[PDB]
CSV table of N, CA and C in Angstrom, one decimal:
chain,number,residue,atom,x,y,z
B,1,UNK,N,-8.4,-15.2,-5.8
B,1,UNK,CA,-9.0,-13.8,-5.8
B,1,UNK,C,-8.7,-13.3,-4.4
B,2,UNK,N,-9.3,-13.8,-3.4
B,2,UNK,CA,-9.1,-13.5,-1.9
B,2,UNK,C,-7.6,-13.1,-1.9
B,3,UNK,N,-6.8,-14.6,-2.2
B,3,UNK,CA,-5.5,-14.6,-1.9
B,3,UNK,C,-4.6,-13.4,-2.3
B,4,UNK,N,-5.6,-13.2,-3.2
B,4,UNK,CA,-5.0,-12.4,-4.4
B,4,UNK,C,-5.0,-11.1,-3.6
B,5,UNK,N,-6.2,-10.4,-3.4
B,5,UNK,CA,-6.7,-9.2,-2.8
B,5,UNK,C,-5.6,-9.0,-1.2
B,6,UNK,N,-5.9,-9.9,-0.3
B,6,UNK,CA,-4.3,-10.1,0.5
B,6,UNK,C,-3.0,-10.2,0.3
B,7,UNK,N,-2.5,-10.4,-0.4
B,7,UNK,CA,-1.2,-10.3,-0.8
B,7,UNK,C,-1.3,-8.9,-1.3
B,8,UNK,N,-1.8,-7.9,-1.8
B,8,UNK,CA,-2.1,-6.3,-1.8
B,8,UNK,C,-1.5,-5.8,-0.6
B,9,UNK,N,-2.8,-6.1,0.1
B,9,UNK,CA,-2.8,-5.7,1.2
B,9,UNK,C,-1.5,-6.0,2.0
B,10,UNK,N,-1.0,-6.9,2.0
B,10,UNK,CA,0.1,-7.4,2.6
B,10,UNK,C,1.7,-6.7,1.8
B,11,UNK,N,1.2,-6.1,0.8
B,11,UNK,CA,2.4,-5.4,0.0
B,11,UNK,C,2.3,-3.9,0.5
B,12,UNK,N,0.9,-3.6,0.7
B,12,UNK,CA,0.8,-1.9,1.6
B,12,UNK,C,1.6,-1.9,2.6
B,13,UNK,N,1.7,-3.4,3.4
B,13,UNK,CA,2.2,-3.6,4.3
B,13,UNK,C,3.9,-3.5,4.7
B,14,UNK,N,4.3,-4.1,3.8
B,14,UNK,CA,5.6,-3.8,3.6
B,14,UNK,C,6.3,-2.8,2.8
B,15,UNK,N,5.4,-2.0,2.3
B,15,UNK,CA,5.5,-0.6,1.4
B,15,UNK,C,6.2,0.2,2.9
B,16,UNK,N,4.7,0.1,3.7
B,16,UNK,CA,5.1,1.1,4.9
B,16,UNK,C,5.8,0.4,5.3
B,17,UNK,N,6.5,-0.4,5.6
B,17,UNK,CA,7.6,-0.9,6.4
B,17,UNK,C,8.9,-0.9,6.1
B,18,UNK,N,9.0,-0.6,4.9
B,18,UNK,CA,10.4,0.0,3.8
B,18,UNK,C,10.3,1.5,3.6
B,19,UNK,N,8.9,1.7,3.5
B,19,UNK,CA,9.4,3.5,3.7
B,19,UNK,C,9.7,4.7,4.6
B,20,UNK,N,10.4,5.4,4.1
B,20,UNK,CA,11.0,6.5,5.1
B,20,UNK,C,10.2,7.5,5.2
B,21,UNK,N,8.9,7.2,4.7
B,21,UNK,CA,7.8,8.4,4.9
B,21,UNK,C,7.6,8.8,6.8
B,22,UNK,N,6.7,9.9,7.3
B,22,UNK,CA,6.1,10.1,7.9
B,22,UNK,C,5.1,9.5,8.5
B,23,UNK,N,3.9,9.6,7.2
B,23,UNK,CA,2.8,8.8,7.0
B,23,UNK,C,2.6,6.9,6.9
B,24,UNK,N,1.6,6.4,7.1
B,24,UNK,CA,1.1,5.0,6.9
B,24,UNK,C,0.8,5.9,5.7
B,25,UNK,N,0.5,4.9,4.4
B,25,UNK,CA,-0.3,5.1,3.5
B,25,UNK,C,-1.7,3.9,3.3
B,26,UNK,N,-2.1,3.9,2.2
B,26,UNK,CA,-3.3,2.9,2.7
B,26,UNK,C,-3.8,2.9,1.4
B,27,UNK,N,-4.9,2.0,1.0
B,27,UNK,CA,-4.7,0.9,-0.2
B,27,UNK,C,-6.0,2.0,-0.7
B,28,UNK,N,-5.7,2.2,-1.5
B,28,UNK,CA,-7.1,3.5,-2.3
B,28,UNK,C,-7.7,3.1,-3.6
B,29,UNK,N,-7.1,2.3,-4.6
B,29,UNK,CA,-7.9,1.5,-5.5
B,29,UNK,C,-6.8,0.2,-6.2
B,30,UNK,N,-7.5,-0.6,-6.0
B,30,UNK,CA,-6.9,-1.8,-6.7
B,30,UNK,C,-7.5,-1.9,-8.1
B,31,UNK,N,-6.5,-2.1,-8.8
B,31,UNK,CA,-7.1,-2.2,-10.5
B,31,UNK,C,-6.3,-3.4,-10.8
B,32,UNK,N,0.7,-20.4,-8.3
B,32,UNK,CA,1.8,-20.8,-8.2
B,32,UNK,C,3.1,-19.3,-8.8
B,33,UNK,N,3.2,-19.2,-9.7
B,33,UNK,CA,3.7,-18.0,-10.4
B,33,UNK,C,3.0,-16.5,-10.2
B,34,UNK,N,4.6,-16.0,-10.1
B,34,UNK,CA,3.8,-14.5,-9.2
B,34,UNK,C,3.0,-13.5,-10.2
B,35,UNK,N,2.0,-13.1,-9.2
B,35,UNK,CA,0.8,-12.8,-9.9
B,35,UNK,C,1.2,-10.8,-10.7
B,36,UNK,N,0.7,-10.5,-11.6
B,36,UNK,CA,1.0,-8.8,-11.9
B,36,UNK,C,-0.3,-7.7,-11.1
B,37,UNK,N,0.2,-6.9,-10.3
B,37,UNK,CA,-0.6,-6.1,-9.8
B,37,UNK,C,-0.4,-4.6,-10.1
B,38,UNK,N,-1.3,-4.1,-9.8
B,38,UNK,CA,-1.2,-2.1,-10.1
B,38,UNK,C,-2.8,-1.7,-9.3
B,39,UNK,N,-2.3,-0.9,-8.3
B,39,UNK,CA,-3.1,-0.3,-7.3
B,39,UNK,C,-2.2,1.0,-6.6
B,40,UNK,N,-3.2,1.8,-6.5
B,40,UNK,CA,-3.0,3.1,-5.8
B,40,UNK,C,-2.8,3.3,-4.2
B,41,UNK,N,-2.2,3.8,-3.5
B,41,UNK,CA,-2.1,3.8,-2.2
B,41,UNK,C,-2.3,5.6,-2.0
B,42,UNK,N,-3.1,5.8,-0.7
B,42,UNK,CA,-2.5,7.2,-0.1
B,42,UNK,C,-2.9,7.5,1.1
B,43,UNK,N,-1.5,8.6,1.1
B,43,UNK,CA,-1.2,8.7,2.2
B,43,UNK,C,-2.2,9.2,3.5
B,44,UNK,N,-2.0,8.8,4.9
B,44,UNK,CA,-3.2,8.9,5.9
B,44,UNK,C,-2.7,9.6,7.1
B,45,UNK,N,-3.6,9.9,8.0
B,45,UNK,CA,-3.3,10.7,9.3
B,45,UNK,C,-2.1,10.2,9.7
B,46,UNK,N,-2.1,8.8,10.1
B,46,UNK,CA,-1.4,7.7,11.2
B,46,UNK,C,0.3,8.1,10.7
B,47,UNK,N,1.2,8.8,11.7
B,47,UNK,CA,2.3,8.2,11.8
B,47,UNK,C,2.7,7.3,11.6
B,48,UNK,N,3.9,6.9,10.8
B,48,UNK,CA,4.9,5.4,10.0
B,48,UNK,C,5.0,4.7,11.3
B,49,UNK,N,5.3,5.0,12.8
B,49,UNK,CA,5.7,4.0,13.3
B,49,UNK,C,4.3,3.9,14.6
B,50,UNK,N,3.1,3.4,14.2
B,50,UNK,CA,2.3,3.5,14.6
B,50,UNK,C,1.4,1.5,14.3
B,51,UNK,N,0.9,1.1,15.2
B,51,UNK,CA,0.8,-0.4,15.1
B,51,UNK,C,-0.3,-0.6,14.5
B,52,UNK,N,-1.1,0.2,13.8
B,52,UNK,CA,-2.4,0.1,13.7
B,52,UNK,C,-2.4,0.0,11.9
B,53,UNK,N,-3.8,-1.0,11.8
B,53,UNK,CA,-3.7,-2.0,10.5
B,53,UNK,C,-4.0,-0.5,9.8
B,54,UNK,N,-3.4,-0.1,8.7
B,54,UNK,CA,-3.5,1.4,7.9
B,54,UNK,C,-5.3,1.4,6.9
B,55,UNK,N,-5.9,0.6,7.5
B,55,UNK,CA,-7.2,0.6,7.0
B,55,UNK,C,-7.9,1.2,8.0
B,56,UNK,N,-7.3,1.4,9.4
B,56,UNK,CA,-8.1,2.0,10.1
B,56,UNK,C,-7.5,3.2,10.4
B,57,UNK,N,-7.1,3.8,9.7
B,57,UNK,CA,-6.2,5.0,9.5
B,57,UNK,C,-7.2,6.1,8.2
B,58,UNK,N,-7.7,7.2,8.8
B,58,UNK,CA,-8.4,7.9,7.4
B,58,UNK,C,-7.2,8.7,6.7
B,59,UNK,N,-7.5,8.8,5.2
B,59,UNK,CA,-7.0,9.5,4.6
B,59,UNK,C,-6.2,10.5,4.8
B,60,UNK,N,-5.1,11.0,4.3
B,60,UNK,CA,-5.0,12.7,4.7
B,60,UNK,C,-5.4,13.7,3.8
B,61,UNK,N,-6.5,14.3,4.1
B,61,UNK,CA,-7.2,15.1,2.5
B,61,UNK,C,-5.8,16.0,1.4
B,62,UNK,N,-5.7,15.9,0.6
B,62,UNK,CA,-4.5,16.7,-0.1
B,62,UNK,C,-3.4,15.8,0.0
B,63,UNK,N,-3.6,14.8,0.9
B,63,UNK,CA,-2.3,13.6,1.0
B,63,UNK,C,-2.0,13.1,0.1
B,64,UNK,N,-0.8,12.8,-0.1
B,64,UNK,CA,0.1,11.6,-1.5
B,64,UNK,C,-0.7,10.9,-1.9
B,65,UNK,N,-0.8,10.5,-3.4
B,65,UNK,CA,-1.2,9.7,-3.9
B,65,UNK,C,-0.4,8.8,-4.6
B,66,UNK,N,-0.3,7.4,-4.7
B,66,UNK,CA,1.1,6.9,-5.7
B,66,UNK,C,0.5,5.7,-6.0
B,67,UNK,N,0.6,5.1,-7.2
B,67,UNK,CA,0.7,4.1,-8.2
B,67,UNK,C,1.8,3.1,-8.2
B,68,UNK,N,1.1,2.2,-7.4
B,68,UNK,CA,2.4,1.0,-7.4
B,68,UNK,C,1.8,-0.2,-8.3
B,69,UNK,N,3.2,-0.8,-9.1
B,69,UNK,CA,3.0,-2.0,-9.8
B,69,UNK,C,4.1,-2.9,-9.4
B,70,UNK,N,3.5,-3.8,-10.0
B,70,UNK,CA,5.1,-5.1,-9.9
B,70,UNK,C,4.3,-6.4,-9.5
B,71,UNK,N,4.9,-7.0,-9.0
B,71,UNK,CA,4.0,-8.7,-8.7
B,71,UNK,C,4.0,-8.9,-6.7
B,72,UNK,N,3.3,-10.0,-6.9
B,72,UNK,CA,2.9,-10.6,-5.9
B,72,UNK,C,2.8,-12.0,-5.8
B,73,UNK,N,3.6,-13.3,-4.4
B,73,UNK,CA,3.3,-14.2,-4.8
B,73,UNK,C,2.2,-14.5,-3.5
B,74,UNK,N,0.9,-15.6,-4.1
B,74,UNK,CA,-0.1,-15.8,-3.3
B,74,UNK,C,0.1,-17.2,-2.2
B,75,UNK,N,1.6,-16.9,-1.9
B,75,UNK,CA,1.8,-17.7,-0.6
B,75,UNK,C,3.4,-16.6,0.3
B,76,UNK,N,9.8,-11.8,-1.4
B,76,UNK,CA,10.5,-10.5,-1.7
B,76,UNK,C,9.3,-9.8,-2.2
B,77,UNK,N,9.5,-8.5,-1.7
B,77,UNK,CA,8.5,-7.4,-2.0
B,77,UNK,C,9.2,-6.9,-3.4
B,78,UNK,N,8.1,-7.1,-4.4
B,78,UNK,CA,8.6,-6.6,-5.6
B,78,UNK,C,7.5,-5.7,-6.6
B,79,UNK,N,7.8,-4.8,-5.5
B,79,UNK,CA,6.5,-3.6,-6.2
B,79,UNK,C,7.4,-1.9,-6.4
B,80,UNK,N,7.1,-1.1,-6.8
B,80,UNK,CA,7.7,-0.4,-6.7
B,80,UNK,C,6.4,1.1,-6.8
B,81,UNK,N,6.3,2.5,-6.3
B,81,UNK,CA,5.1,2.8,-5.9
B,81,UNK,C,6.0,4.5,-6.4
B,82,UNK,N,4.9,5.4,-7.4
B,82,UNK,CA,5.9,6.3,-7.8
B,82,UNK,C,4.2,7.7,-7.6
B,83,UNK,N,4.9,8.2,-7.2
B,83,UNK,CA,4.1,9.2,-6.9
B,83,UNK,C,3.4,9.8,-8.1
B,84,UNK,N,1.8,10.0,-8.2
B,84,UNK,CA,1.3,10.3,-9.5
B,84,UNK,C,1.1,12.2,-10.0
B,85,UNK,N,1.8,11.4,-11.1
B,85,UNK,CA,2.0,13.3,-11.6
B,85,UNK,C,0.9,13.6,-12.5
């Protein structure tokens, strides 16, 4: 579960780390073999190239909101995160 809830977290992490956004985004609802996940991310004040963990980053009110799924293993980033219409 923990491991589980980190490996999230650690996929926000490389979300922002692959994307060409502006913004950090930041983890807004979470809902051996790699695990299936689907959680919301959105977007926050903090500039992309900014060193700070994106949980300590507030929101940006009216900021992006996106739905990412795909898996996680709990030890390749394979999520993919689509903007909700």
């Amino acid at each position: 579960a923990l491991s589980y809830r980190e490996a999230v977290l650690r996929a926000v992490d490389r979300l922002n780390e692959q994307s060409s956004e502006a913004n950090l985004y930041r983890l807004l609802e979470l809902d051996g073999t790699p695990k299936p996940v689907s959680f919301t991310v959105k977007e926050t004040v903090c500039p992309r190239p900014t060193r700070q963990p994106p949980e300590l980053c507030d929101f940006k009110e009216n900021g992006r909101v996106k739905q990412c799924v795909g898996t996680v293993t709990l030890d390749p980033l394979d999520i993919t995160c689509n903007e909700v219409q």
